[PDB]
Amino acid sequence: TIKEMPQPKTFGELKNLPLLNTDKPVQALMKIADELGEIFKFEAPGRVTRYLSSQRLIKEACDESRFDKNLSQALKFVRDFAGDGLFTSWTHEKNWKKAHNILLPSFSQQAMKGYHAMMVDIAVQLVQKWERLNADEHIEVPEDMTRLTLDTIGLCGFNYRFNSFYRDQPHPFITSMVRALDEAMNKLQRANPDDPAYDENKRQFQEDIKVMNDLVDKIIADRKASGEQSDDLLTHMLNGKDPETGEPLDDENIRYQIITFLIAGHEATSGLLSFALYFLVKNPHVLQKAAEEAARVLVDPVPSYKQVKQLKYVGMVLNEALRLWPTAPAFSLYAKEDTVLGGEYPLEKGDELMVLIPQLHRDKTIWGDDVEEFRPERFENPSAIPQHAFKPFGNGQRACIGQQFALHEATLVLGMMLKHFDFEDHTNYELDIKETLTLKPEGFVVKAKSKKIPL
Ligand code: HEM
């Protein structure tokens, strides 16, 4: 029963483009998704995209023999500074498989034991910052969670300390980075390269890239000159060789990997932590369950790797937050060959499909009718969840390599926050989701009363 594909209103040669001409594109798309259903054709002047929203179709899109990772327009733009790092390479580019094969064992759950001490370091700095606040001062959740993630990836990545908790103005690198990312997203909604985009922006963009390249390159050069063997990712990349080709990574790719770990990892992981706290503070009974587990398990001044794995309920909290608002809301796919989706919608070779994750997670057919409710218990038995119903980390060989890293950190940090402080939503915050490459709660502020437990 092949059905015709819907489409929202168009604007001449500008097509549906104006439809997403807003500061909250993904959220608008979810709205359109509600109206048009599990699949719609979004057309732009010289680009076509089909957005999927149902587990029915998406489980078919996740068939790797039929569809493969497509570099969306945004990724192409991000490639200007992330080059051929894992995130912005095609599956068929030689450096994708090389870096993938080498980095894989370094991102396993087992490998987290080696990064744990470095994760604890930045975690304790966050707790102490909060411990030292004068009672009357509040906390800027997204802002602190961001400082937490940048520093953790910097330390675990290339053993470099950005020291974000010692300054107002971030390290110039981070500034150039957020700015480059910002610009990258701006080109996406550019009317044309001279509206607004002018030589001034392009100049700035090229300067930011220099700042990032200079720092990373130097660090890479120094490491191989000194010959230092730390437990960071840079060490693994300098001493690794692809089992297949027998080749090591080039210094430039290595640099791109490091930049990739930062741009791809920080915003999403900080967003995750913000939403989880948001939901916890809005659902007292859940917070009470989590705080008790945390106090019950984290019996030492500093969390051990083993202990973090015993925080079962906190894990459920993170997953449920990931269900409701996946911080990386979408990923693109293209058809390797002509085919039909759900035996209804015909697809041609190279057609792009954009998976709308937030909509996938709201599929009443899989999640029941209480999809908008925050209930961690629904992940009590993950094995009861259908395949391809929960995809916050992408699909297949192209899924987030930093998944275990993200979850281990988020679980460590949340556990420590719930153990040392009681949180107060003193302003009865109303959720405003800011969108960049990721999703994050804009302006979320809270107040934390310490339980005076030592670190
Ligand atoms: C909780 C936070 C995170 C979320 C929600 C998330 C989500 C995702 C998603 C959806 C993808 C696939 C994108 C696509 O198919 O186009 C992805 C890819 C990737 N992520 Fe994450 N991510 C998170 C944290 C991290 C962290 C901390 C790192 C860095 C260490 C990271 C590194 C990567 C890389 C390098 C890839 C590409 C892997 C490959 O294609 O070989 N992510 N992530």
Curated annotation (Swiss-Prot):
The record marks 268 as: Important for catalytic activity. It is found in: Cytoplasm. Changing residue 82 to F: 800-fold binding affinity for laurate as substrate. High coupling of NADPH consumption to laurate formation. Very much more effective in indole hydroxylation. Favors omega-2 hydroxylation. (9Z)-hexadecenoate binds at residue 51. In the N-terminal section; belongs to the cytochrome P450 family. Changing residue 330 to P: Enhanced activity with small non-natural substrates with altered product profiles compared to wild-type. It comes from the Bacteria. Heme binds at residue 400. Induction: By pentobarbital. Expression is negatively regulated by repressor bm3R1 at the transcriptional level. It comes from Priestia megaterium (strain ATCC 14581 / DSM 32 / CCUG 1817 / JCM 2506 / NBRC 15308 / NCIMB 9376 / NCTC 10342 / NRRL B-14308 / VKM B-512 / Ford 19). Changing residue 264 to H/K: No significant stimulation of NADPH oxidation induced by addition of fatty acids and no hydroxylated products, but cytochrome c reductase activity levels are identical to wild-type enzyme. More negative reduction potential with dithionite. The gene is cyp102A1. Functions as a fatty acid monooxygenase. Catalyzes hydroxylation of fatty acids at omega-1, omega-2 and omega-3 positions. Shows activity toward medium and long-chain fatty acids, with optimum chain lengths of 12, 14 and 16 carbons (lauric, myristic, and palmitic acids). Able to metabolize some of these primary metabolites to secondary and tertiary products. Marginal activity towards short chain lengths of 8-10 carbons. Hydroxylates highly branched fatty acids, which play an essential role in membrane fluidity regulation. Changing residue 188 to Q: Higher activity in the hydroxylation of highly branched fatty acids. This is Bifunctional cytochrome P450/NADPH--P450 reductase. Changing residue 264 to C: No effective fatty acid oxidation. No effect on electron transport from NADPH to FMN. This protein is a target of protein engineering. Its selectivity-directing and activity-enhancing mutations have been extensively studied and the designed mutations allow this enzyme to act on non-native substrates and/or in order to enhance production of synthetically desirable end-products. The lineage of its organism: Bacteria, Bacillati, Bacillota, Bacilli, Bacillales. Residues 1-455 are annotated as: Cytochrome P450.
